[PDB]
Every structure is written in C-alpha cells, then in structure tokens.
Amino acid sequence: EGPKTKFHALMQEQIHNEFTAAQQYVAIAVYFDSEDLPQLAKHFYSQAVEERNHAMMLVQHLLDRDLRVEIPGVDTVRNQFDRPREALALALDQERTVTDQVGRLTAVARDEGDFLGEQFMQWFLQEQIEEVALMATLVRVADRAGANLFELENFVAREVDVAPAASGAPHAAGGRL
Amino acid sequence: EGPKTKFHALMQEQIHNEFTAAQQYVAIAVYFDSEDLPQLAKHFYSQAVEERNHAMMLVQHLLDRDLRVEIPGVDTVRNQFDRPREALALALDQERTVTDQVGRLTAVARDEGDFLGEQFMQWFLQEQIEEVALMATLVRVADRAGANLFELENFVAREVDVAPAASGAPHAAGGRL
Amino acid sequence: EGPKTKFHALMQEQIHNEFTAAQQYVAIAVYFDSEDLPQLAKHFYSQAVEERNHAMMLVQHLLDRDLRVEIPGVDTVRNQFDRPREALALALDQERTVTDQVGRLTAVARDEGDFLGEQFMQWFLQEQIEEVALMATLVRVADRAGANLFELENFVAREVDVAPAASGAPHAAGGRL
Amino acid sequence: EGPKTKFHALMQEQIHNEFTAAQQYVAIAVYFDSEDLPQLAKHFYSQAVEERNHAMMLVQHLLDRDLRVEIPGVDTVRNQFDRPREALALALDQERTVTDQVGRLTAVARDEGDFLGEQFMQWFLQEQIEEVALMATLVRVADRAGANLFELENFVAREVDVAPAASGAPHAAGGRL
Amino acid sequence: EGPKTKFHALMQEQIHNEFTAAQQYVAIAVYFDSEDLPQLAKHFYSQAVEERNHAMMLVQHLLDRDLRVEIPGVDTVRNQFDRPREALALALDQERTVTDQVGRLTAVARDEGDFLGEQFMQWFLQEQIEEVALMATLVRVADRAGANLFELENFVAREVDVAPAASGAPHAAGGRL
Amino acid sequence: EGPKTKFHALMQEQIHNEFTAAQQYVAIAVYFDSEDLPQLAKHFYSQAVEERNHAMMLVQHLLDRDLRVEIPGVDTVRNQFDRPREALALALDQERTVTDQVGRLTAVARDEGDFLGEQFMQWFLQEQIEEVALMATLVRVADRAGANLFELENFVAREVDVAPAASGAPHAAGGRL
C-alpha cells in the first residue's frame, strides 16, 4: 500500500487519541451537567470543542503533506464518577498523557529527520503548557473546596475564562471551531 | 440500577448513532479534501458539525428529563472510496437510515405513551425532510456530472448553501455550534 | 409507473384542492371589488396569495421526498353572489372543508406510518385554527352589520390585519410570496 | 343578462388563457425543480408570478369599465417532459401563442371602435416583445448546450435577470406581485 | 346547551388548573419574599406570569374554535411552608402534575380525532420539558445547599435566567405578558 | 398565632377581593372577545392586568410591614351575559363596590390609628376616581349606542386610551405589569 515512516504511523494514532480525548471531555461535561454544575460543564463543553479542533489540525497536517489519513472510531469513554474531584482528576490525568504523547511525537520526528513534523508540533507543546496548568489549578481548587461545590463553581466562573485563541494556531480541517 | 423504558433505551442507541454519523461525515469530508474537491469538503465539514449538534440535542433532552445518559464510543467508519459518487451515495444511504431510525423512535414513543418523547422528535423529522432532499439532489447531480467533477463542484458552490439555522431547534448540550 | 402509497395519492388531491381554493378566493375578492368593498377585497386578495403559498408548500414537500407531483388544473369556481354575507359564508365553508381535509391527511399519514408526512402537516393544522377563527369572526360581524355594509368595512379595516408571517412555515416552492 | 360586445367576450377568454398560462409555467418550473436545474426553476417561478399578474391586470381592466368578469377554472396543463429542451420549447410556443392572442384582441378592439380597449393592450404587446425574445434566447442556448445542462444553467444564472419592472404597467387587481 | 366533546370538556378543566397553578406560584413567591430570598422570589413572580400566559393561551384556543369557555374561580392554594426546600418541592410536584395533565389532553384529543386539538398542545409538551428540568435542578440545588440558603440564592442569580421567549408560542388572549 | 388588628384582617379580605375582581375582568373581556368586540376586549384585558397589579400592591404592603399574608383562592365569577350593556354594567357595579371597600379600609385604618395604613390607600382612592369615571362613561355610551355596537367600538378605539401609568403608584410585589 506504500512505505509508512513511523512519524506518519504514530501521528495517525495521535489523531485517534485526540478524538477519544474529545469524547471523554464531552462525557465529563455531561456528568457535570447532570450534577448541576453548569460553569464547570460550560468549561468542559468548550474543552471538547478545543480537543476536536486539535484532532482536525492533525488531520489537516496529514492532508497537506499528502499522506493517507484515516478518520478512526473512538473507544468507550468513562461516564461513572462518584464525586466531581474524580472527573477533574481524570481530565488532569488525560492532559498529562496528551503532553507525554506529543513529546513522543516530537521525539520520533526528530529521530527520523522529519523537519516539517518536528516543527508542526511546537504549537501543541505550547498548548499543553497552559492546558495542563489550567487543569492542575482546577484539581487543586476542587481539593480546597472539598464537598462545598459552590466555591469551585464561583472560582470557575470568575477566574477561568476561555479567552479568544491567539494566532500561531495551524489550520484545522474544516475551519477551527 | 433502575427501570428503563424502551424509549429511553433506544434513544441512548440513537445518541450512539448520531455520533457515528458525525464521524462518518468527517471521514467523507476528509476523502473529499484529499481528492481536491473543497466545496464538497466544505459542505460535509458543515454537515458533521450539524450531526454533532443533533447528538448534543438528544443528550440535552436526556439531561432535561433526568434520565441517565452515556456518552458512547464510535464504531470504525468508512474511509476508502474509489470515486466521489460512492461517498455521496454513502451519505444519502446514511441519511435514509437516520430517517428510518427517527421514525422508529417516534413510533416507540407513541406506543409507550411518552408524550414528551413523541413531541421532542418532530423537529428531527422536519430536519430529515430537507436533509435527505439535499443529499438526493447531490447524488443525482453527481450522476449527471459523471467523471467531470468540476460541474458538481460548481453546483455545490452556487446552489447548495448552509443558510442560518431557523428557530424551533431544541437546545443542544453545550450550545449549538 | 411505480407504487403509490395513499398518503402520496391523497396529497396530490390536496394540491389540487389548495389551487382551487386559491382561485375561489380570487373570485370572492373580485366580487367584493366589483361591489365597492375594497377592504374586504384587499383581505381576500391577500388570502388568495396565502392559499397559493400553501399549494406551493405542498408541492415543495413532494419535490423534497422525490415523489412525482402533477401541477393540476382548477375546477370552475363560483362568481355569482346575491349579497356579501353569502360570499363570506362560502369562504367560511371552504375553510372548514380545508380543515377537515388536512385532518384526513394527518389521519392517513398516521395510519400508513409516514412519519415525515405526519410531521409536515402540523403547520397546516396550526394555520387552520387561526384561519377558520378569522373567517367565522367575519361572518358573525357581517350578520351584525346586516345591510349596512360600511360597518363591516370599518371592522375589516381597523381590526383584521395580515401581520408578518411567523416562522415555522415550511419552504414553499419558488419562494413564499 | 345584458349585451356583450365581442371585445368583452374575448377578453374574458384571454383572462382564462393567462390563468392557464400561469399554471403551465408553474408546471414547467416544477419539472425543472425535480430535475435539479434550480436557476431555470427560479426563472420560471418568477414567470408564473408575472403571468398571474397579467391575468390580474386584465381582471382589473374589466372591473374598471364595470363589465361583468368571471374568474374561471384552469385546464389541465402538461407535466411530462422527456428532456429540458422540450419544456423550454413549450414555453416558447406558449408565448408565441400569447402574442398572437393579444394581437387578436387589439384587432377586435380596433374593429368595434373600443378605444379604451385598443389603448389598454399596447402594454401587453410591449411585454410580449421582450418576453418572446427571452424565451427564444433560452431555447437556442438549450440547443447549443445539448445534453450538457450545466452550461445552460450558468447562462441563466449570469445573463438572464428579472430586473425591477418598469412603469407603464397598468394596475393589477390586488396589487402587482 | 349543546353537545360537548370531552376534549373540550377536559380543556376547560385544564384552564381551571393553569389558573390555580398561577395562584400557587404567586403564593410560593410571596413565601420566598417574606423569608428574604428575593432572587428565588423574582424567579417565581416570573413563573406566575408565565402560567397565567399559558391559561390565556388555552382560553384563546377555545375562543378561536368558537367553543364556549368559562373563566373559572381558583381553589385555595398553599401558603404555609416550614422551610424553602418544601416550597420548591411543591413547585416541582405541580409541574410534574401539569406534564401528566397535558399528556392526558394530547391522549384524549388523539382518541376523539381532534386534530387541531392534538396539534395545539405540542407547544405545551415542549414547554413542560424545559420547565420540569428547571424545577428539578432547583430542588437538587436546594438539597446540596441545605440550611445555607445564600448558595441557593447565588445559583438562582447567576445560572437561572428567564431568557426572551422563543417563537412557536401560540397567541394568548389579551396579549402574552 | 399572633394578635391581628382589624386593619390587617380586612386588608387580607381586600387582597381576596382584588384577585376576584381581576378574574371577573378577565371573564368580561373573554365574553367581549367571543362576541367580536375586540377594542372593548382589549380595554378589559388591560383592566384585568391593572387589577392584578393592585392586588400585588396590597400584598407588597403586607410584606413590607412584616404581617402574615395569604394568597387566597378566587370565587366563581360571572360568564353569562345576554347583551354587552349588562357586562359593562357589571364592571361599573364592581368598581363602585371597590370604591366603597377602599373607603371602608381608610375608615378602619383611621379608627385604629394605623397611620401607615391610612396613608397607603390614598393612592387607591385616587385610582378609584378615574376608574369609576371611565366605567360610567362606557356604560352611558353603551346606552346611547343601543343595539348598534360599532359606535361603542369606535368610541372605545378613539377616546379611551390606557396612557402610561403616572408615578405615585406604590411598589407591586413582583414588579408592576
């Protein structure tokens, strides 16, 4: 079918990962919406869109370099959470994983001398900094709040804002949402 | 875990279906984008968003009636197409299926006397009319064009427009995109 | 030539009916215009347009579901009226008939499990409520006025208004007039 | 019932003709809309309105001179066409007929010394010039295009425009649409 | 006095119910206003208006179909509540009842082939979805808050908003308030 | 349960009265709307709102002085009227009663040295002047018109206007409508 370099072969895997991550954010947000925490839910509904946009960016990068790309299925994501702290912890966990994955991609790109591939994912590293920062902040605030969830709610409302996205963001397939 | 009526149990299945349908639209659009048919691709990138919005509407309806709802995984969708006519045919097929599914939901709702459920899906029937209409039109135009794909391209560009959505649309979880 | 379901076969008949109804409204309006009752005439010239729009909506619905549709002829409509009360009574009569016809369509659609067809005609039921209301009001006012027609004229002028059409109206073939 | 001059008696016939012509334009437009030629359809949906307006103008002229006028039925119009060239040819044919009919009216008016009647139909002659011109142009373009219908489509889109109607148009009963 | 169908006879009962429901909302709001919970009170003063508007809509529907309609008295409503949780629970209860009542109306309409009546109350079903959703949310939030009522107060202030009413709402007798 | 002064005990009764009066205005307006007198109906739909606002003002006054207040039921109001003159006479009657009731309140307040209570109801006396004036005017005009109801209709349309409410109006519970 044609010789795949492992940057290509692993970036396909990453497309799959970002899609599953988006679905997981939707599930987290839906759990928050059922438990009557609408600011938390709002934030995570925004994050799901952001993650889908990341997936589209990866897809668009494959389309640009004319490598074959599959739009894959998504694995079953988690829906049961006993308290909000666990769902937030899951988000934080996921984002640390995503960071390590993007690290793994940059490394494999640099090994096999794929300079376009090296360069493309600097933006993903940049986004991971701020993203893991925000998640860690939310998890720590959720621990300080404890069972009193309204204070978590107020913290998300006043201090966490999804500001307009800056430039430097690569093109996403079908337009950035 | 609690007694599920089969309207609830089948609407969960429909949530799963709409999510898979959205992913299938993304795959179709990505195939069109690789084959350098960007108006076709643009339309289908819009349709994927529309289908995700439908899924969110179903989810939001479950959240409103306080029934448990799972955000599910997505099955593997199709990526190989030998010519554009087949991908368009797949879209048309999918939408006829979706129509029959929504029909099945309205029927099961009316059987078990779920009046909120009966009423909720009239909007989905309405959307299916225009949607299957548009798909059928595209498939017939793709047959008239044959191998000369630029005329299909021009038809999509001039005549097929994604106009502003009208009201009557129920609330989608996390805001309609 | 192909298997017709009786929803399709009866909706064709309804297209014929709405066209004849529009021509009948034109005839009524022309009688009112000859007898120097221009507010009455104005209202009915508006109603004829509304009825033609309904016919176009039915036609457009057939075009969308890709069923064959004939644009039919129109039967001879009534022109002789001895007094205005009779022409108004004819209008009222016609609209009660139209209501029963649309009822018959909803019933036949629901019998043969045509869910798109069931759903499409809810708007027609809605329109019939307000329409028969208005006609009944005009007939009762025409009885209170008796031979003194100027008071009927003033009632039509001040109180009966053709307000901007609301949304929810399905698409009419060749644009709503 | 009263002595009819044959200008009056033939103008009634013309009212009938213009109504049938309008219904025939609707049928042509509906055939074009089913065969996915929406620019052609758009033009003919506009022409049907124009023809109804002509009928209303004739009606209004009868109302002004206080002669009795019947709003008649419409004969069955044609719906089957094997290719677009034939429907266009039918339109062209119809308009040549209409021209000859209006000629016949001007002649009969001038015979029986009906000076108001002579004068009223100069506008109809004027409209027939441009109208038959446009139809002939469309038929010739449809022949140059042959089976490749998209070029016909583009010609209708770019070059054929329904510009704002000029003055000189007599009053139509119930307002010009 | 004339033959009443039981759709008519039960819709009269529903008019009575909506009036009593409005008075009950006023009583709930007045209890909240005495206990110094003004955001809660504000919301319920808005809900009382909404319920009166529903009553007016039902009345207007009877007026349109020219059936006799009584504007009835209202039963004694509840004023004593020992804590806010109970008044909220009463509201939730009431709205679940209203949902079942509107269900009963749709069912009786569909039994006796009253297609206008079937169609009229789809809007009421739609409103009940969102309304019971909101009430359930408030009751669950009131349980999470417990005796600390200020957090309930803040939740009502930030997250619960009476947005502009959408279209699709039928006409209310004497104008929607 | 606590010592009630009879100003408080009679003002509760007045709250009940104003609520019943509002429902009676709704019934009168609905009778006028069924008999096709929409200007009359419009006026009385406005008066019902005004009466509900008065009830809310009384309620708000009880809430301000921290006395217990019941939101009561409403008695059955009158719906049968043989002619419009009687419904207007009923309105006039009601308003004369309301005037006497408010007089009785001012008197009882002044007896028991409730200076806040004395002062609060001066506005109600002021409103009763203009209100009974308007009702008397309508009844006299209805007598001059006799069976010819259109002239009554025109008088209500041109001369009776619900102007913007002036200041001096005390606060109504849940905002003045």
Curated annotation (Swiss-Prot), chains A, B, C, D, E, F:
Residues 159-177 are annotated as: Targeting peptide. One of its GO terms (molecular function) is iron ion sequestering activity. SUPFAM superfamilies: Ferritin-like (SSF47240). GO terms for biological process: intracellular iron ion homeostasis; iron ion transport; response to hypoxia; response to nitrosative stress. Induction: Induced by 1 mM reactive nitrogen intermediate sodium nitroprusside dihydrate (at protein level). Induced by exposure to 50 uM FeCl(3). A possible member of the dormancy regulon. Induced in response to reduced oxygen tension (hypoxia), repressed by carbon monoxide (CO). It is hoped that this regulon will give insight into the latent, or dormant phase of infection. InterPro entries: Ferritin, Ferritin-like, Ferritin-like_diiron, Ferritin-like_SF, Ferritin_DPS_dom, Ferritin_prok. Disruption phenotype: A single deletion is more sensitive to oxidative stress (cumene hydroperoxide but not plumbagin). A double bfrA-bfrB mutant grows 40% less well in the presence of an iron chelator, is more sensitive to oxidative stress, has significantly reduced pathological effects in guinea pigs and a marked reduction in its survival in human macrophages. Fe cation 2 binds at residues 51, 95, 128. The keyword Metal-binding applies. It catalyses: 4 Fe(2+) + O2 + 4 H(+) = 4 Fe(3+) + 2 H2O. Its EC number is 1.16.3.1. Fe cation 1 binds at residues 18, 51, 54. It is found in: Encapsulin nanocompartment. It holds the Pfam family Ferritin. Residues 1-146 form the Ferritin-like diiron domain. It comes from the Bacteria. Its main location: other. The C-terminus (residues 163-181) targets the protein to the encapsulin nanocompartment. Interestingly the C-terminus is localized iside the ferritin cage, in theory it does not touch the interior of the nanocompartment. Belongs to the ferritin-like superfamily. Prokaryotic family. Homooligomer of 24 subunits that are packed together to form an approximately spherical molecule 12-13 nm in diameter with a central cavity, in which large amounts of iron can be stored. Possible cargo protein of a type 1 encapsulin nanocompartment involved in protection against oxidative stress. Iron-storage protein that displays ferroxidase activity, catalyzing the oxidation of Fe(2+) ions into Fe(3+) ions, that can then be deposited as a ferric-oxide mineral core within the central cavity of the protein complex. Retains ferroxidase activity inside the encapsulin nanocompartment with a slight decrease in rate. It is not known if this protein is normally found in the encapsulin nanocompartment. PANTHER family: BACTERIAL NON-HEME FERRITIN, FERRITIN. This is Bacterioferritin BfrB. It comes from Mycobacterium tuberculosis (strain ATCC 25618 / H37Rv). The lineage of its organism: Bacteria, Bacillati, Actinomycetota, Actinomycetes, Mycobacteriales.
